C-alpha cells in the first residue's frame, strides 16, 4: 500500500508537469500565431503601398 | 486496507494511461509547430530574395536618374 | 535686277528662318523644362521606394526574429 | 547695294547654320527622352512583377495561417 501510494503521488506529479508543458506550449503557439498575423497585416500594407507607387509611376509616364 | 489498496492500484493504472496520452499529445503538438516553423522559414528566405530584387530595382532607377 | 531679286529672296528667307528658329527654340526649351520636372518627380518616387524597401527589410528582420 | 547684299547673305549663312544646329539638338533631345521613357517603362514592368510575387508570398503566408 505504501509503495503504491508513493507511486500515486509520483504519477500525479508527472501528470501535473505534463499538463503544465502542454498548456505552456499552446500558450506559446497562440502568441506565435498572433505575432505572425500582424506581420501578414504589415506585409499587406507594404504591398498596397508599393502598388500606390507603381500607380504613381504609371501616371508620370 | 484491502479497500484502499484496490482503489489506489486502479487509480495508478488510469494515471499511467493519462500520462502516456498526454506525452503523445505534446509530441504531436510540438511536431506540428516544427513543421509550421520550417514552412515559414522557406517563406522568409523567399522574402529575402524579393528584398534583394527590389534593391536591384531601386539601384537601376537611381542609375537612370543620375 | 538680278542683284535686286537676290537681295529680296534672301531677306524673305532670313525672315522665315528667324520664325522657324524662334518656334524650335521654344519647343526645345519647353520639352527640356518638362523633362526636368519629370526627373524631379521620379527622384521623389525613388526616395519613397527606398523607404518602402527599408520597411520591408524591418518586416523581414522581425519575421526572422520570430522564427528564432 | 553691294554691302547690303553681302550683309544679308552672311546673315543667311548664320541663320541656316543655327537651323541645322537646332534640328540636330531637337533630334538628340528627342532620342534621349524616348530612351529614358522606355527604360523607365522596363522598371515599371519589373516593379509590377515584384508586387505580383510579393502578393503570392502573402497568399502562401495567409494559407499557412488559416
Swiss-Prot record, chains B, D:
Modified positions (Phosphoserine) in chain numbering: 20
Location comes to: Cytoplasm; Postsynaptic density; Synapse; Cell projection, Dendritic spine
Q: Where is this region: Required for tetramerization?
A: 4-66
How is expression of this protein distributed across tissues?
Highly expressed in cortex, Purkinje cells of the cerebellum, hippocampus, striatum and olfactory bulb. Isoform 1 and isoform 3 are expressed in skeletal and cardiac muscle.
Instruction: Give the protein family.
Output: Belongs to the Homer family.
The UniProt function text for this chain reads: Postsynaptic density scaffolding protein. Binds and cross-links cytoplasmic regions of GRM1, GRM5, ITPR1, DNM3, RYR1, RYR2, SHANK1 and SHANK3. By physically linking GRM1 and GRM5 with ER-associated ITPR1 receptors, it aids the coupling of surface receptors to intracellular calcium release. May also couple GRM1 to PI3 kinase through its interaction with AGAP2. Differentially regulates the functions of the calcium activated channel ryanodine receptors RYR1 and RYR2.
Description of its domains: The WH1 domain interacts with the PPXXF motif in GRM1, GRM5, RYR1, RYR2, ITPR1, SHANK 1 and SHANK3. The coiled-Coil domain forms an antiparallel tetrameric arrangement.
Quaternary structure note: Tetramer; this tetrameric structure is critical for forming the high-order complex with SHANK1, which in turn is necessary for the structural and functional integrity of dendritic spines. Interacts with GRM1, GRM5, ITPR1, DYN3, RYR1, RYR2 and SHANK3. Interacts with IFT57 and OPHN1. Isoform 1 and isoform 2 encode coiled-coil structures that mediate homo- and heteromultimerization. Interacts with SHANK1; forms high-order polymerized complex with a mesh-like network structure, at least composed of SHANK1, HOMER1 and DLGAP1; the complex formation is SHANK1 multimerization dependent.
Query: Under which name does UniProt file this protein?
Result: Homer protein homolog 1
What organism does the UniProt record list as the source? Rattus norvegicus
Instruction: Recall the taxonomic lineage recorded for the source organism.
Output: Eukaryota, Metazoa, Chordata, Craniata, Vertebrata
Gene, per the UniProt record: Homer1
Curated annotation (Swiss-Prot), chain C:
Q: In which tissues is it expressed?
A: Highly expressed in cortex, Purkinje cells of the cerebellum, hippocampus, striatum and olfactory bulb. Isoform 1 and isoform 3 are expressed in skeletal and cardiac muscle.
The UniProt function text for this chain reads: Postsynaptic density scaffolding protein. Binds and cross-links cytoplasmic regions of GRM1, GRM5, ITPR1, DNM3, RYR1, RYR2, SHANK1 and SHANK3. By physically linking GRM1 and GRM5 with ER-associated ITPR1 receptors, it aids the coupling of surface receptors to intracellular calcium release. May also couple GRM1 to PI3 kinase through its interaction with AGAP2. Differentially regulates the functions of the calcium activated channel ryanodine receptors RYR1 and RYR2.
Q: Where in the cell is it found?
A: Cytoplasm; Postsynaptic density; Synapse; Cell projection, Dendritic spine
Member of which family? Belongs to the Homer family.
Q: Where are the stretches annotated Required for tetramerization? A: 6-68
Q: Which organism is it from?
A: Rattus norvegicus
Name assigned to this protein: Homer protein homolog 1
GN (gene name): Homer1
**Residues found modified as Phosphoserine:** 22
Q: What does the entry note on its domains?
A: The WH1 domain interacts with the PPXXF motif in GRM1, GRM5, RYR1, RYR2, ITPR1, SHANK 1 and SHANK3. The coiled-Coil domain forms an antiparallel tetrameric arrangement.
Oligomer and partners: Tetramer; this tetrameric structure is critical for forming the high-order complex with SHANK1, which in turn is necessary for the structural and functional integrity of dendritic spines. Interacts with GRM1, GRM5, ITPR1, DYN3, RYR1, RYR2 and SHANK3. Interacts with IFT57 and OPHN1. Isoform 1 and isoform 2 encode coiled-coil structures that mediate homo- and heteromultimerization. Interacts with SHANK1; forms high-order polymerized complex with a mesh-like network structure, at least composed of SHANK1, HOMER1 and DLGAP1; the complex formation is SHANK1 multimerization dependent.
- Lineage of the species this protein comes from: Eukaryota, Metazoa, Chordata, Craniata, Vertebrata
What's the domain of life for this entry?
Eukaryota
Q: Give the fragment's position in the full-length protein.
A: 302 to 364 of 366
